[PDB]
Amino acid sequence: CLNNDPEILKKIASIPNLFPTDLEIFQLFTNPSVDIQIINQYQLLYNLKNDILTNLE
Amino acid sequence: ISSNDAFNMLSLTTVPCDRIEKSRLFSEKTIRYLMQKQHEMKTQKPLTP
Amino acid sequence: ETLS
Amino acid sequence: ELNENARELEQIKPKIALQDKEITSVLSNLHESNKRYRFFKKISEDPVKAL
Amino acid sequence: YSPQLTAIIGLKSGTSHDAIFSIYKYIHLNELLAFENNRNNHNS
Amino acid sequence: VKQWDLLPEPIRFLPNQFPLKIHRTPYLTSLKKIKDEIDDPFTKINTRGAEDPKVLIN
Amino acid sequence: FLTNELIRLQMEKLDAKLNHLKKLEKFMELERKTLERQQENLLIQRLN
Amino acid sequence: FLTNELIRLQMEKLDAKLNHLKKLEKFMELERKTLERQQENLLIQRLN
Amino acid sequence: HSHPSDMVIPDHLAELIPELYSFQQLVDSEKRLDHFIHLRNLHMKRMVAQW
Numbered sequence: 001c002l003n004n005d006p007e008i009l010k011k012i013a014s015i016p017n018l019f020p021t022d023l024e025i026f027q028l029f030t031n032p033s034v035d036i037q038i039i040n041q042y043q044l045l046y047n048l049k050n051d052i053l054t055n056l057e
Numbered sequence: 058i059s060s061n062d063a064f065n066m067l068s069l070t071t072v073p074c075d076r077i078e079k080s081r082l083f084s085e086k087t088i089r090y091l092m093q094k095q096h097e098m099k100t101q102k103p104l105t106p
Numbered sequence: 107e108t109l110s
Numbered sequence: 111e112l113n114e115n116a117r118e119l120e121q122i123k124p125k126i127a128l129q130d131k132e133i134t135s136v137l138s139n140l141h142e143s144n145k146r147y148r149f150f151k152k153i154s155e156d157p158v159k160a161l
Numbered sequence: 162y163s164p165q166l167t168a169i170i171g172l173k174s175g176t177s178h179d180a181i182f183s184i185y186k187y188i189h190l191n192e193l194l195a196f197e198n199n200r201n202n203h204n205s
Numbered sequence: 206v207k208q209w210d211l212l213p214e215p216i217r218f219l220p221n222q223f224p225l226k227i228h229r230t231p232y233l234t235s236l237k238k239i240k241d242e243i244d245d246p247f248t249k250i251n252t253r254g255a256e257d258p259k260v261l262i263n
Numbered sequence: 264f265l266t267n268e269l270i271r272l273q274m275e276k277l278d279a280k281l282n283h284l285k286k287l288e289k290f291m292e293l294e295r296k297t298l299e300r301q302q303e304n305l306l307i308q309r310l311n
Numbered sequence: 312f313l314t315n316e317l318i319r320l321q322m323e324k325l326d327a328k329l330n331h332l333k334k335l336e337k338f339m340e341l342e343r344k345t346l347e348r349q350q351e352n353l354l355i356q357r358l359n
Numbered sequence: 360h361s362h363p364s365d366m367v368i369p370d371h372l373a374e375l376i377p378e379l380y381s382f383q384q385l386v387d388s389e390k391r392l393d394h395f396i397h398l399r400n401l402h403m404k405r406m407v408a409q410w
Contacts, residue, residue, distance in 0.1 A: 010293070013292075013293055013296055014289040014290075014292050014293045015289075015292070016288050016289070016291075016292040016402065017292075017401075017402065017405060019296075021299065021409065022299060022303065023409075026182065026185070029185070030185075049296075050300075053296060053297075053300050059142075059145070059246070060149070060246045063146055063149055063150075067150070067153075080312065081312065082312050082315060083312070083315055084312070084315075084316060086316075086319065087315055087316060087318075087319040090319050090322070090323070091265055091266065091269065091319075094269055094322070095265065095269070098269070098272060104286065104287075104290055108311075109308045109311055110311070111334075111337070111338055111341065111403070112403055112404065112407060114334070115334050115335065115338075115400075115403070118331060118334060119331070122327050122328075122331060125327065126324060126327065129320050129323060129324050130324075132320055133317065133320050133321070134361065134365055136313055136316050136317050136320070137317070137365060137366070138365075139313055140313045140314070140317075140372075143313065144372060145244075145245075145246075149246065152247075169310070170309065170310065171309045172309075183306065183310070186306060186307070186310070187310055190307060190310060190311075233363060233364055233367055234367060234369070234370075236362075236363075236364040236367075237364045237367040237369050238369065240364060241369060266315065266318065266378070267378075267381075269322070270318065270322075270381050270384075270385065273322060273325065273385075274384065274385075274388055276329070277325070277329065277388055277391075277392065278388075280329070280332060281391065281392075281395060284332070284335075284336065284339075284395075287339055288339075288402075291339070291342055291343070291346070294346055295346065298346065298349050298350065298353065301353055302353055305353070305356060305357060314376050314378050314379055314382070315378070317382055318378060318381070318382055318385070321382060321385045321386065321389070322385070324389065325385065325388065325389055325392070328389070328392050328393070328396065329392070331396070332396075335396065335399045335403075338399075338403055342406065345410070
């Protein structure tokens with residue numbers, strides 16, 4: 001809406017430890033003592049990370 | 058107690074106002090530190106892919 | 107195309 | 111390397127604690143001498159009312 | 162790996178971790194997901 | 206006819222109470238000010254209620 | 264005057280060091296993300 | 312006088328942590344090496 | 360028993376002695392440093408857990 005900083009996806013992807021990795025998601029999925037609702041939130045955040053990385057390219 | 062002590066120093070001391078000397082502004086510790094740091098600041102990769 |  | 115850095119931090123901490131003690135002492139002394147300064151200034155600026 | 166595996170993943174040899182991770186990536190990629198039904202069935 | 210209200214007009218519509226400055230003193234600074242005002246030689250912290258009416262209202 | 268100079272120089276050195284280290288961290292983070300994405304892409308291509 | 316003493320104590324305090332920054336700077340070299348190794352692997356797997 | 364208000368330089372000492380202003384700035388800079396170091400520690404731990 002503002003159109004001030006074009007390199008916003010790169011700056012967001014450069015923030016250290018702002019997203020979970022692949023193997024952490026994997027360990028969450030294989031560990032059976034977890035709730036489905038937390039799985040869903042981590043899945044949404046992971047999809048957001050992937051979409052940002054795609055739009056960067 | 059502290060007001061008593063301050064007024065005692067002011068009024069009950071028999072020293073003329075001239076003979077009171079000035080004290081230091083810099084202890085010798087800070088002078089040594091400042092000289093050492095002046096020396097050490099007188100001695101003083103673009104993201105390779 | 108076999109990859110995609 | 112994690113263990114080494116933890117070691118160096120634990121070695122560096124005591125001097126910092128000592129210097130914090132000294133800093134608090136100096137701050138208290140500054141408060142006391144500011145009290146005295148305000149006293150003497152009030153007396154010198156209007157002596158009769160101050161007394 | 163056994164010929165039933167290296168057919169699915171283009172890898173002759175790897176740790177158990179690699180095989181498990183790739184099989185899970187496979188069932189997620191084809192939306193077979195906690196029940197899963199296919200090619201892994203007839204191959205394995 | 207006479208007209209009057211039960212309560213007085215709030216406190217901010219009074220012509221004397223018009224904002225010139227907001228006093229946003231933090232909590233630690235307020236504690237420091239309280240310590241400085243109690244630790245003064247010429248402190249008025251114990252005037253008493255019968256010697257000053259403003260102290261009584263407060 | 265020397266004291267004022269030394270304080271100013273100290274604050275400058277501190278903020279310069281912090282800026283440099285933060286730039287390094289951001290570079291490393293973006294690089295990790297890129298490597299992860301590339302390896303996932305290769306794995307998916309092999310499977311397909 | 313007391314203010315100058317305070318300033319000296321505070322600068323002495325800052326110097327120790329400014330020195331402690333260097334080891335944390337070395338862990339960055341560790342991470343850099345590991346990233347290059349992961350890149351080795353990705354390259355060779357793509358060629359395979 | 361030390362009180363958190365000991366470290367406050369009220370408002371008028373700092374305009375009687377301007378250097379006190381700078382002193383506060385030094386204090387704040389130190390805070391920054393500390394937080395940065397803190398983050399680094401956390402970060403390193405995470406990387407180990409990853410590796």
